[PDB]
């Protein structure tokens with residue numbers, strides 16, 4: 169039995185990694201992810217300069233998941249580049265870096281700095297097109313003209329295979345429009361579906377008050393809320409972008425959800441809210457649970473069922 | 481305490497009604513809604529000609545809500561107009577009709593027929609801009625140019641106060657854009673937030689198969705999945721459209737959820753998945769539970785706390 173994944177020139181021990189933003193902001197965070205049983209890890213979505221993010225409280229755990237408006241707190245691109253170049257143990261597992269400049273000009277500058285490190289170390293880029301908690305900045309993925317600009321400029325500046333973190337789409341027309349843009353950029357090798365369901369609102373009935381401070385309580389939803397949306401996006405892009413990989417992100421708490429993501433077409437599976445709740449020990453549990461499901465169904469590899477969801 | 485709502489010249493006994501599509505397709509359905517303790521009712525989203533809708537299975541109840549791809553099965557506009565004109569007991573409660581033509585032309589033809597019945601009986605129009613389960617028909621509400629056309633032509637053709645059923649939005653820029661369109665049409669007196677979270681996917685791990693037949697398993701999500709999205713949309717439009725009412729729809733299972741909707745700014749509160757689960761007895765329960773919360777908090781009327789959610 170094997171959870172191994174062969175993509176992007178690497179052998180991943182298993183399909184699991186952290187979702188960008190969870191357990192990956194500091195050196196200590198990244199150490200714990202590297203020491204975990206995860207198949208990979210991704211750094212916090214970074215900007216050209218450091219950010220401390222939004223005021224508190226900006227995170228609230230829910231029965232059915234989480235709401236957050238973190239506001240992209242990060243140590244700046246130079247920190248994560250230095251981590252990728254000097255600190256990270258590539259013998260343990262491959263490294264992704266998430267980059268989320270607040271303009272195309274910022275992104276271009278950032279990805280240019282990554283080029284030499286990708287060439288030297290093999291660090292992988294995930295371009296974030298769906299940061300929903302920065303006041304005054306719309307999610308790039310919801311504007312297909314802006315998305316096309318970003319992909320053109322980053323393709324030009326970076327010039328190596330990279331991936332994109334997409335916001336969730338809720339309309340067949342949007343899947344079609346999104347795929348049409350993505351399919352025009354051959355350097356986009358993977359699509360991560362999905363980021364948080366943006367701009368939800370949670371109110372405490374007792375004090376009649378919102379539970380987070382930023383943006384009048386509006387924040388991104390994660391966890392059990394997002395699983396059906398996540399599976400739909402994974403499967404939609406799996407079918408619409410056959411020349412690209414799809415990574416699943418959203419609502420993974422168990423091997424069962426991981427199995428569903430992979431069945432829908434996911435190559436790798438990212439874990440956000442559940443990891444925030446449980447800590448990096450979750451990866452050991454997820455490996456065991458996924459292996460259990462496969463044993464019960466008589467599958468030896470992930471390849472036996474990846475993307476083999478049945479329709480009626 | 482009083483649950484009464486006084487809007488559009490009508491007295492509503494309480495803020496509760498069915499969500500369009502649930503318990504409102506047939507004459508018997510509408511009878512049961514009229515007999516219930518609900519403050520109002522709305523007819524199934526109808527088309528110019530009858531429709532039998534999508535093939536089976538097209539509905540699946542979930543632990544956390546529902547997925548459906550009904551495909552607007554309805555008896556045609558003539559049936560609902562006849563119900564509104566001849567059958568409905570207006571002494572029991574006011575009636576809304578939902579109209580969901582698959583083109584602006586169809587919608588215009590339908591609303592023209594309603595005009596004399598509105599004038600005579602006081603039937604209220606909810607124009608559906610968010611039908612997500614018709615193959616080849618995108619949700620109108622996600623195209624602001626198309627939305628503007630619909631509101632223009634329907635405003636002209638109907639010429640009386642009406643409301644709109646909106647799809648959920650997930651970006652602040654979209655709230656701004658939607659509100660800019662809506663605020664140009666003074667005849668739009670209410671906004672219903674929200675329709676289903678469109679195009680989710682549920683997969684059964686046992687048989688590795690999607691749970692509904694239409695559109696490769698893709699269907700609208702309702703129930704516990706949608707509450708934070710619903711509250712966000714209600715509050716966003718409550719603040720952006722001060723010349724209009726907002727109706728809340730999504731994730732109502734209890735008086736507590738109803739309270740949150742009203743706190744967010746809802747005038748009426750619609751019940752979909754929970755009503756499908758429980759039957760029209762739910763309306764008696766909802767009245768009791770909301771009265772209890774208001775008694776506990778010392779609120780004499782809904783107007784004491786409507787839209788008075790606190791931010792930090």
Ligand SMILES: Cc1cc2nc3c(=O)[nH]c(=O)nc-3n(C[C@H](O)[C@H](O)[C@H](O)COP(=O)(O)O)c2cc1C
Nearest residue numbers: 187188189213362363364390391418419439440441
């Ligand atoms: C605290 C927190 C921080 C996050 N930070 C980022 C981030 O920096 N970049 C990003 O692309 N997504 C970020 N996300 C979104 C997650 O990567 C993920 O897409 C989302 O939480 C859905 O997965 P889940 O259901 O497992 O939580 C963050 C989510 C949380 C809860």
Ligand SMILES: Cc1cc2nc3c(=O)[nH]c(=O)nc-3n(C[C@H](O)[C@H](O)[C@H](O)COP(=O)(O)O)c2cc1C
Nearest residue numbers: 499500501525674675676702703730731751752753
């Ligand atoms: C079986 C079913 C049929 C529906 N039919 C319609 C419809 O005809 N028109 C409409 O605007 N919404 C329709 N909806 C959406 C609901 O009106 C409502 O917006 C959605 O279910 C969210 O509310 P809930 O969380 O209480 O279910 C339907 C939903 C379900 C579950």
